[PDB]
Amino acid sequence: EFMVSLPRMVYPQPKVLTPCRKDVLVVTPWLAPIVWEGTFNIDILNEQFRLQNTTIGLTVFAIKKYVAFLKLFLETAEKHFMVGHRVHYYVFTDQPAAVPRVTLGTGRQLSVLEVCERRFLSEVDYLVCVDVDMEFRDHVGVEILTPLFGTLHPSFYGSSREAFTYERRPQSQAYIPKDEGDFYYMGAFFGGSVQEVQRLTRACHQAMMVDQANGIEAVWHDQSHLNKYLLRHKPTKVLSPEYLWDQQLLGWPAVLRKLRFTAVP
Ligand SMILES: [Hg+2]
Ligand SMILES: [Hg+2]
Ligand SMILES: [Hg+2]
Ligand SMILES: [Hg+2]
């Protein structure tokens, strides 16, 4: 928590009387930034995070045929994910011997765990939880780091809340009525401090057990419960769909200046 001074740095003065974006919302109503290209100066942010010796954990589950996605996923993470910072990849897999041997940059490591415990608390400062059937195509960096973040679902970012595919059955712990909801977050990319991520996954797991005891299974299971949690425990940042895109399904709209992390065709 003690933070050394930034060095002198030369960059454009912020413009108080020029909006950052005129096409999109860049702050939530609980004053959490919404991360779009143009909002952040990455040099400032990199300094702040490097001066804290920040370590980022990146977790992926790769079960059965999903092991095939690891090579592209890790290679492209090496090009685009937290470059310059300490990174610890945790690959959770039923096929440890099939994990590809990917060459890592300095300060980057990978653990294979055969299939949250406290090993994370001792090893990393932040945890980022993503799906493996994806590739990085542009910068994903410390601009996302915060106590708790969710990402806007790319199919729903323009939708009204009544059209969100939340769990709508009142018998479910994930239940959200039609007049509630900020955003529709996708399960494929969330994170935060280790403490906040473990709170979330603990809460989701308990709610999911309660539903199962009541003989009910939520519509988009993990994602429905994620959405309920983030409704009731507001994220400290929200990532734009730059951070979770499918170009084959959704193209490349003007509102996206960059496509950073995308579905594999
Ligand atoms: Hg700006
Ligand atoms: Hg995780
Ligand atoms: Hg939950
Ligand atoms: Hg969850």
UniProtKB/Swiss-Prot annotation:
Subcellular localization: Golgi apparatus, Golgi stack membrane; Secreted
Residues binding Mn(2+), per UniProt: 131, 133
Claim: Transcription is one of the keywords in the record: no
Pathway recorded for this protein: Protein modification; protein glycosylation
Any single Gene Ontology cellular-component annotation: extracellular region
Positions glycosylated per UniProt: 53
Processing after translation: The soluble form derives from the membrane form by proteolytic processing.
Effect seen on changing residue 154 to S: Altered substrate specificity in group B transferase
Keywords, comma-separated and alphabetical: Blood group antigen, Glycoprotein, Glycosyltransferase, Golgi apparatus, Manganese, Membrane, Metal-binding, Secreted, Signal-anchor, Transferase, Transmembrane, Transmembrane helix
Binding positions for an alpha-L-fucosyl-(1->2)-beta-D-galactosyl derivative per the UniProt entry: 153, 165, 223, 246
Tissues of expression: Expressed at high levels in testis. Also expressed in pancreas, uterus and lung and salivary gland.
GO biological process, one term: lipid glycosylation
Active-site residues per Swiss-Prot or TrEMBL entry: 223 (nucleophile)
Membrane topology type: Single-pass type II membrane protein
Listed result of changing residue 211 to N: In allele B104
Top-level lineage group: Eukaryota
Keyword Magnesium assigned: no
Chain sites annotated for binding UDP-N-acetyl-alpha-D-galactosamine: 61-63, 66, 131-133
Catalysed conversion reaction: an alpha-L-fucosyl-(1->2)-beta-D-galactosyl derivative + UDP-N-acetyl-alpha-D-galactosamine = an N-acetyl-alpha-D-galactosaminyl-(1->3)-[alpha-L-fucosyl-(1->2)]-beta-D-galactosyl derivative + UDP + H(+); an alpha-L-fucosyl-(1->2)-beta-D-galactosyl derivative + UDP-alpha-D-galactose = an alpha-D-galactosyl-(1->3)-[alpha-L-fucosyl-(1->2)]-beta-D-galactosyl derivative + UDP + H(+)
Lumenal compartment residues: 4-265
Function: This protein is the basis of the ABO blood group system. The histo-blood group ABO involves three carbohydrate antigens: A, B, and H. A, B, and AB individuals express a glycosyltransferase activity that converts the H antigen to the A antigen (by addition of UDP-GalNAc) or to the B antigen (by addition of UDP-Gal), whereas O individuals lack such activity.
Family listed: Belongs to the glycosyltransferase 6 family.
Protein name: Histo-blood group ABO system transferase
Organism annotation: Homo sapiens
Lineage: Eukaryota, Metazoa, Chordata, Craniata, Vertebrata
Shown stretch of the complete protein: 64 to 345 of 354
